[PDB]
Amino acid sequence: ANKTLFKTVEEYLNRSQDCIHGETDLQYICVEGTNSIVEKPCRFLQEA
Amino acid sequence: VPRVATGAGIPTSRQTTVMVSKYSEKSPITIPFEISAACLTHLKETFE
Structure with a gap:
């Protein structure tokens, strides 16, 4: 998840x-x- | 049954036959009821 922002x-x-x-x-x-469930912000914002 | 399956690897549950026998239940009631022999005497002895 260091892709480009829209990827x-x-x-x-x-x-x-x-x-x-x-x-x-x-x-x-x-x-x-x-x-494809809505994850937590892990893999997106990386915050608990 | 409302059938639906899908997917690429999502397992397809097969078609379903449902027959349910559902019983009735009895509840026989009773009220007691009293007529005296002195009540039945006057119809059935025929006084003056």
Whole structure:
């Protein structure tokens, strides 16, 4: 996410298919995507 | 069932047959009702 500024937001959308799996008690990462979720500002603004 | 699936790698859940038998429930009621033998005597002894 040091792309150019309008590709950074298209990195934030097209390639943020990184979710949390649902059925697990502890939060485990997603297996096969199915959507581009609105991430947190990580990979966009890098702030907690 | 309203069927829909999609995607490139998103798993396609197959078509669904749903038949539900739902029973009825009985509730037979009863009120008691009293007529005395002294009430029934006057129709059925025929006094003067």
